[PDB]
């Protein structure tokens, strides 16, 4: 309740996120997440064990309810925050939709603008405040086993989706350079491997690693490999916060610690592991679910449970982490961001891309 009649921050393949540059208290220490560009009969039934959710008139209530009633059950309220729907004037959105641009990338602006056809939107806490913030999009930290992975593709079990992906990514000139990062070290649950992988991240950040100083981006994009001058540049900007060219071994170590310590990565890999069958498997259920033939036996309910659980792992595989630091002794909050319910149609796309990735990496040999 209130209706609206804000400075650029970030943007994934869904929302614009802007920060609050004003003096109002309900809005201070907040950020507003805006949509770019309300359930299929099949979605309603997949998510039907929660009526409030399946009843939703628009996404804002939807994500909000999803996160609160589907996810928070799984991750606890500590690192999660459901969001606050909030009214908006269509004219508001157009106004912003120009205040944007600029910092805005291009291959991105291309695909999507702001959805001027919502009058709703999400307000969230600005985990870049309380300061040095890290955001990790870890991606998937495990390997499959599922007896539904073809024989032809026996690498899906020995080489991570992320790693196989970088290759293709490359062929398509998304990234100029293979990433060092191995989501396995990170989800490996050991202090030693955590740090390996966060150095990996610093090293070549891409769209996984990002650092924020009083809300201001000082490392990260996605990006190409950290050229040594950016090193001194970044190590420079550190001068102050950290008492120590060592401020940057120490800082990574400081991240290593909070990530491993909070053990937030574990209470995550579990949800990611809800993908019990892998898309090669789960795709068959999807078609039965929707009423068509698996162009690639269990009761309707088990199939549904399966596709459903897949989509929740799917949420957890595409989320990001935020770690904040203050005051050597430091404070820190870890929070999850980007915990969206995935469209049921993505099942065809999920499988599409998987097919393509495993097929390309299989060639490479
Ligand atoms: N709660 C938050 N606090 C501070 N910054 C955020 C928050 N949520 C998102 N951001 C920034 O905005 C970016 C885009 O937000 P995100 O929710 O990931 O959008 P998308 O779903 O389009 O990826 C994030 O990667 C992060 O850098
Ligand atoms: Mg994102």
Domains of the chain, by residue range, sit at 1-130, 131-365
Task: Specify burial of residue 130 (Cβ count, 10 A radius: 0-12, 13-18, 19+).
Answer: middle
Task: Say if CB 123 and CB 30 are below 8 A apart.
Answer: yes
Atom of ligand 1 nearest to the CA of 11: 14
Q: Is the minimum distance from the CB of 56 to ligand 1 under 6 angstroms?
A: no
Contacts 24+ apart (CB under 8 A), 26-33: 27/123, 29/125, 29/126, 29/129, 30/123, 30/124, 30/125, 30/126, 31/123, 31/124, 31/125, 31/126, 31/128, 32/6, 32/86, 32/121, 32/122, 32/123, 32/124, 33/83, 33/121, 33/122, 33/123, 33/124
Task: Specify burial of residue 120 (Cβ count, 10 A radius: 0-12, 13-18, 19+).
Answer: middle
Mutual angle of helices 191-203 and 247-262, in 10-degree steps? 130
Residues 6+ apart with CB under 8 A from 96: 6, 16, 18, 34, 114
Task: Say if CB 314 and CB 345 are below 8 A apart.
Answer: no
- After which residues does the chain become discontinuous at a C–N distance over 2.5 Å? 5, 37, 130, 221, 244, 296, 327
Task: Specify burial of residue 14 (Cβ count, 10 A radius: 0-12, 13-18, 19+).
Answer: middle
Task: Say if CB 124 and CB 256 are below 8 A apart.
Answer: no
Any idea which fold 1-130 has? Phosphorylase Kinase; domain 1 (3.30.200)
Q: How far is the CA of 337 from the centre of ligand 2 (A)?
A: 8
Residues 6+ apart with CB under 8 A from 191: 256, 260
Residues 6+ apart with CB under 8 A from 53: 47, 62, 65, 66, 69, 70
Token pair listed for 124: 């969230």
Residue 181 to residue 203: CA distance in whole angstroms? 8
* 305 annotated as a binding-site residue: no
Task: Specify burial of residue 5 (Cβ count, 10 A radius: 0-12, 13-18, 19+).
Answer: exposed
Instruction: Enumerate the β-bridge partners of residue 213.
Output: 132, 216
Token pair listed for 320: 């990001």
Mutate to test the pocket of ligand 1, among 32, 320, 321, 342 (most ligand atoms within 8 A of CB): 320
Residue 21 to residue 8: CA distance in whole angstroms? 10
Tokens 């740090």 correspond to: 195
Number of the ligand closest to the Cα of 10: 1
Contacts 24+ apart (CB under 8 A), 188-191: 188/141, 189/265, 189/266, 190/260, 191/256, 191/260
* 151 annotated as a binding-site residue: no
Residue 162 to residue 142: CA distance in whole angstroms? 10
Among protein residues, the one with the nearest Cα to ligand 1's atom 15 is 11
Give one DSSP letter per residue of 108-177, joined into a string.
Answer: HHHH--B-TT-SEEEEEE-TT---EEEEE----------TTS-SS--STTTS-HHHHHHHHHHHTTS-SS
Of 161, 213, 212, 179, which is closest to residue 357 (Cα–Cα)? 161
Please tell me whether residue 222 adopts helix, strand or coil conformation. coil
Of 39, 38, 32, which is closest to residue 15 (Cα–Cα)? 32
Distance from chain centroid for Cα 349:
18
Residue 325 to residue 334: CA distance in whole angstroms? 9
Residue 134 to residue 213: CA distance in whole angstroms? 9
Tokens 């291009």 correspond to: 106
Distance from chain centroid for Cα 19:
19
Check the CA dihedral 357-11-96-108 and report its sign: negative
Residue 259 to residue 274: CA distance in whole angstroms? 22
Q: How far is the CA of 336 from the centre of ligand 1 (A)?
A: 10
Neighbours of 6 (CB within 10 A): 19
Residue 352 to residue 174: CA distance in whole angstroms? 18
Residue 342 to residue 59: CA distance in whole angstroms? 11
- State the structure-solving technique: X-ray
Please tell me whether residue 69 adopts helix, strand or coil conformation. helix
Query: Alpha helices of the chain — where are they, by DSSP H?
Result: 41-46, 51-55, 59-65, 72-75, 90-99, 107-111, 161-171, 183-187, 191-203, 228-238, 247-262, 266-272, 278-290, 300-317, 346-363
Neighbours of 126 (CB within 10 A): 22
Residue 170 to residue 331: CA distance in whole angstroms? 38
Please tell me whether residue 221 adopts helix, strand or coil conformation. coil
Which strand ranges, in their side-by-side order, compose the sheet holding 216-219?
A: 216-219, 211-213, 132-136, 320-325, 334-337
Q: How far is the CA of 34 from the centre of ligand 1 (A)?
A: 10
Task: Specify burial of residue 181 (Cβ count, 10 A radius: 0-12, 13-18, 19+).
Answer: buried
Instruction: Enumerate the β-bridge partners of residue 84.
Output: 123
Query: What's the alpha-carbon Rg for the chain, to the nearest Å?
Result: 21
């Amino acid at each position: 309740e209130m209706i609206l009649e804000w400075i650029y921050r970030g943007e994934g393949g869904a929302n614009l996120v802007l920060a609050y540059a004003g003096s109002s208290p309900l809005f201070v220490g907040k950020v507003i997440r805006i949509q770019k560009a309300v359930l299929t009969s099949d979605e309603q039934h997949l998510w039907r064990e929660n009526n409030e959710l399946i009843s939703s008139p628009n996404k804002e209530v939807l994500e909000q309810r999803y996160v609160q009633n589907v996810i928070i059950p799984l991750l606890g309220p500590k690192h999660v925050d459901a969001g606050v729907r909030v009214s908006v004037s269509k004219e508001f959105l157009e106004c912003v939709d120009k205040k944007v641009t600029k910092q805005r990338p291009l291959w991105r602006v291309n695909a999507a603008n702001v959805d001027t056809s919502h009058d709703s939107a999400l307000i969230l806490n600005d985990h870049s405040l309380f300061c040095i913030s890290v955001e990790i999009k870890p991606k998937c930290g495990f390997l499959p086993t599922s007896r539904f992975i073809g024989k032809e593709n026996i690498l899906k079990t020995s080489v991570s989706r992320f790693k196989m992906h970088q290759l293709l990514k490359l062929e398509y000139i998304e990234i100029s350079e293979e990433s060092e990062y191995d989501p396995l070290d990170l989800f490996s649950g050991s202090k030693e491997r955590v740090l390996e992988a966060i150095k990996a991240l610093y090293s070549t950040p891409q769209n996984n690693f990002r650092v924020f100083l009083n809300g201001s981006l000082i490392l990260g994009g996605s990006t190409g490999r950290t050229s040594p001058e950016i090193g001194y540049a970044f190590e420079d900007a550190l001068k102050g916060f950290i008492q120590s060219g060592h401020r940057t071994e120490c800082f990574l170590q400081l991240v290593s610690d909070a990530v491993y310590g909070s053990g937030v990565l574990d209470r995550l890999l579990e949800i990611q592991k809800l993908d019990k069958l892998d898309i090669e498997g789960a795709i068959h259920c999807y078609y039965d679910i929707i009423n068509q033939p698996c162009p690639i036996a269990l009761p309707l309910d088990e199939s549904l449970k399966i596709v459903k659980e897949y989509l929740i792992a799917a949420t957890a595989k595409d989320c990001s982490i935020m770690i904040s630091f203050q005051s050597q002794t430091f404070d820190y909050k870890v929070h999850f961001i980007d915990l969206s319910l995935k469209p049921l149609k993505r099942m065809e796309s999920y499988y599409k891309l998987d097919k393509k990735i495993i097929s390309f990496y299989n060639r490479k040999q």
